[PDB]
Design a protein around this nucleic acid. Structure first.
Lengths: 62, 356
RNA sequence: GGGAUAACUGGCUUGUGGCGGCCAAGCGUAGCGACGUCGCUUCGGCUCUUCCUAUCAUACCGAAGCAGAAUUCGGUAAGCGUUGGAUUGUUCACCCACUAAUAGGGAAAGCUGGGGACCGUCGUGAGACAGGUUAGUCCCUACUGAUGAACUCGUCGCAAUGGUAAUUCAGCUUAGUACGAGAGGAACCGCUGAUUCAGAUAAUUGGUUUUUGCGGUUGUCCGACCGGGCAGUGCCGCGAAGCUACCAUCUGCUGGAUAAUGGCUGAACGCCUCUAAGUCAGAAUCCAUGCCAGAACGCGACGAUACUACCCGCACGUUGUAGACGUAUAAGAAUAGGCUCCGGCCUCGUAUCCUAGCAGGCGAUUCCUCCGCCGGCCUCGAAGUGGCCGUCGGUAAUUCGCGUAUUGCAAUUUAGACACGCGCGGGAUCAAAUCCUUUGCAGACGACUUAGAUGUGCGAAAGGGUCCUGUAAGCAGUAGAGUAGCCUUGUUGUUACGAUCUGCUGAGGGUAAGCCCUCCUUCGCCUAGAUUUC
RNA sequence: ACGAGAUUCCCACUGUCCCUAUCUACUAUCUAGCGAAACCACAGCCAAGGGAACGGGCUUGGCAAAAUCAGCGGGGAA
RNA sequence: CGCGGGGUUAAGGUGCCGGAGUGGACGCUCAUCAGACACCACAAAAGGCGUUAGUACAUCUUGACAGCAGGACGGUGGCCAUGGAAGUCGGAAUCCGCUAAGGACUGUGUAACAACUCACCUGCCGAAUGUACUAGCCCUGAAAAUGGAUGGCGCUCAAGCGU
């Protein structure tokens, strides 16, 4: 029989993932993301927009 | 035995880690990946099979399903990781204001005798015009990180468990730009996320949990007998396991009051068995009906995550139609689905007349 | 009886016989002479782990009158498997089947059945002897699991490294199609199961019963009844819970590079060539992902940190440093080319920068050059910094005046950076873990999941539900077989006892000990006490 | 005919086995008290090499982190 | 060969373990586990469309080797045999003409022909080629079974081989 890591089986699975399983899982993800979208939507230094410094080693201590 | 599970030692943690989230590309919409639930037990269902090419096609099949109690999770934080030549590294994490007592219990070993001040100074960061500090961390994640995760914790006061210390985990945010998912995580702060939003019906998931322990066991039951490759005695059970390809059969709402009802049987009943789930209690929240068996004992924390790859079987993307859900008692040879059905069968009793 | 000798083999072994003639490049100056051709023909069984390939099967290729089907020979391949019986008649020991197939060896090994040597005496054409003597040498480590000091305790993670997993068959469709005179008779794509292996799980079914839970019954006993004791759990039936069973159920996943081989463009070699430069595809192969563990001396993020001293400034240390003394210097890319200011330049870092002053003073003359600290705006995440502006401080580019002596003719020119500790004076904070009791998602002990401070708390009862058994004790009905008295005959005479049956009674009993719920169902307990910690 | 004689055949039964699972008591385990012996040059990781098919100490690699608890049987001539 | 100090060497070495040269000159070699001093066995008159040096013979402006464009004819389907057999299922002979040259034919092909192809010849092109041996270095020239060895890393105009 053909192994699970056979090249031919991978090619057939790749077509199945692209032509049958893909569209179905894409539609499922759209509905799920919409539900989570609904729940969620329900001076640089002084403002933090300028990302500054908060509060063993890699080099030899000179 | 198998040498792929060779270090048969007790799991380092009781919770179990995902160890792999599905690969992320920015094209898909923003979504979560994993969730937590508590194992309630098992029950029997009848399914109207629609498997073209099978012997049981257009026939009724009896199957065993497991029930996981899933109260909504609360999103209380956000974590960002960066890519390094040494792997993924946590750059910074941004916690939300107003954490609950349960999630603070996770941070303490002796909560009763402690002066509960975890995140007391962190709360002042939000409300004392140090919001620049909070935004600076949020902007740091946006412009340096490639993977953003959400810290969500369970609500075990809703669960019929004597434990009061909730469970934390990081759930990856997949499908979007790093900027998009950061705004996603910040908007989810202090908010409950229900299970029907993370997963849904007739989809196939993976479950991660720690198996039931057995203690010191000999070669006969440990390695299955009729150096590192020679069977020996030691710990059997309490091993971290990742089981894949388990189909969700139903997601119950808990507030429906007819969770166990189908379009075939018109009986207003919930999922809890007559007398309650044995050694667990009553499921009063959202629940996920998973086909077959799943690692872990009852009332054990259960980690549910998505499939790492697009499925290659017709077992996925196939509709699940239910005919009847068992609710009879698991404490014995039960024969009644509802308290009314028992009283109707046996008539009225001596105590019934004496009380009335 | 004496002499030499402990004994053998170790780049051993494997597929193609020997002898004679003919031919025969050479060597040689007759002799050796290969390939061919001719002539003559102790043993058996038992095993577990791993390895090898000299491959039986499964995968992929090359060839064959290989039409199809089934095959045969050969190549890469050890990833994955390699059975159940007979051994009861005969022999060179080998039949029966099942299966995809029923390949061969190494580690050379232990159990189990089959199947002694010296003298002495009496004799030797030859043996006999119950005549004597005698050898018979609970610890460390490895492996499997469990804890663990130091780094304040804890939470969430990363992933170096180590292991690694899936296998074979069948059925449906293609299709009674291609192919074939007929008989027969495929395959790719698609779909559904099953074998072996592996990891889990207890709804359901079966098994198990100290639930000693309920009931029945034997012997003996508590005077009888009730309720029970003993028979190391008397015996029997059911029996939850727990544990388990291919006796039950669920699940087992995808990228890159290759071997044999088939090709493209094209020299060698004016044809030609898959190979030389370049390059396409291609096996169950290889490497990784998915999966398991986590370095207890690998790392990251976050929370709270009581003292000690957490942060800041400077004051030093008779404090530690596999080893300061200008510890100065960023393009990228090619090497049969490159750089540029677009003029030109490139062997050459023997280059560029910085480089003077009591270990570097004081005062001038003169100069806007360089250095430093602080702020403001920004920028630096691969193990996180630099730029711009402003203030202040220092500052030979030129030239002087004052000072250096005495360390006595050299003696490390004690001078840097990091870390650690001791002190002041300014700001800031008022923490945890363990023991203990408890929990059973855990367990040999440690460890682990829990809970203990007012709460949806913990514990003990109780009520209800759900399950198990199978109808309690007692009372009553002439229902009742049967055993006896009263009077005299009874065609219906009465009075007592009366096993059993029926009703009260799906009753009574048990119910978490690893079942479920509690509206004030009742009662009680609480902000401890001990140790340690930056 | 007889025989705790042997063998074969027939019927019946069986955890012998397919293929194991469950249960009970005493141990194994932990604690209090009591408390030995065998044995002991010194030790104790693996690989290749160390002419005398001899290695445990040498060579040169793999490496290599305190202190412990339980299991086992791998190693210590003719 | 007494106990010490200084100097110089032998065998062996100077890429790092490791003290001393990534020393100098000219060449050779690319190995799918090269070689680094074992040179005995496997092992031969052995297989290599690997590479370099050499020896002998041979062809060449009278045009050599390779190629392209053409010829490759006639007696004659030679004789026997064969159902059929014409160069090409077989046996045996294998001559002559025209010639520039062309076999009573080297392969494909047909039932038999036909047709194609080779040998051989000519035109175009243009200068060096062919064969067989010898000597170096390289591949193969047979290997089982715990993971390991030029001592190890590693080394390719070498850190290999010869002087």
């Amino acid at each position: 029989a053909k192994s699970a890591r056979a090249s031919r089986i991978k090619e057939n699975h790749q077509r199945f993932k692209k032509n049958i399983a893909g569209p179905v899982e894409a539609a499922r993800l759209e509905r799920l993301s919409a539900k989570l979208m609904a729940i969620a939507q329900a001076s640089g230094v002084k403002s933090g927009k300028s990302i500054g410094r908060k509060d063993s080693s890699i080099v030899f201590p000179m | 035995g198998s040498l792929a599970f060779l270090p048969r030692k007790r799991a380092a943690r009781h919770r179990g880690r995902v160890k792999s989230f599905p690969k992320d590309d920015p094209k898909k919409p923003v979504h979560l990946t994993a969730a937590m639930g508590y194992k309630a037990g098992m029950t029997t269902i009848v399914r109207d099979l629609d498997r073209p090419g099978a012997k049981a096609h257009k026939k009724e099949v009896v199957e065993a399903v497991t029930i996981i109690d899933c109260p909504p999770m609360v999103v209380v934080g956000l974590v960002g990781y960066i890519e390094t030549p040494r792997g993924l590294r946590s750059l910074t994490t941004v916690w939300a204001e107003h954490l609950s007592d349960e999630v603070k219990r996770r941070f303490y070993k002796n909560w009763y005798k402690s002066k509960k001040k975890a995140f007391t100074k962190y709360a002042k960061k939000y409300a004392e015009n140090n919001g620049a500090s909070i935004t600076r961390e949020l902007e740091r994640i946006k412009k340096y990180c490639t993977v953003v995760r959400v810290l969500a914790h369970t609500q075990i006061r809703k669960t019929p468990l004597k434990q009061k210390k909730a469970h934390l985990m990081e759930i990856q945010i997949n499908g979007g730009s790093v900027a998009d998912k950061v705004e996603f995580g910040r908007s989810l702060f202090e908010k409950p996320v229900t299970i029907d939003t993370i997963f849904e019906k007739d989809e196939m998931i993976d479950v991660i949990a720690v198996t039931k322990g057995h203690g010191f066991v000999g070669v006969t039951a440990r390695w299955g007998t009729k150096q590192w490759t020679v069977a020996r005695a030691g710990q059997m059970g309490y091993h971290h396991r990742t089981s894949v390809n388990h189909k969700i059969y139903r997601i119950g709402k808990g507030d429906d009051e007819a969770n166990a009802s189908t379009e075939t049987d018109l009986t207003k009943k919930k999922i809890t068995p007559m007398g309650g789930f044995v050694r667990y209690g009553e499921v009063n929240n959202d629940y996920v009906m998973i086909k077959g068996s799943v690692p872990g004992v009852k009332k054990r924390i259960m980690t549910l995550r998505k499939s790492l790859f697009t499925h290659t079987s017709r077992k996925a993307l196939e509709k699940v139609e239910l005919k009847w859900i068992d609710t009879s008692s698991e404490f014995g040879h039960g024969a009644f689905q509802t308290a009314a059905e028992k009283k109707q069968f046996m008539g009225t009793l001596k105590k019934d007349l004496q009380t009335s």
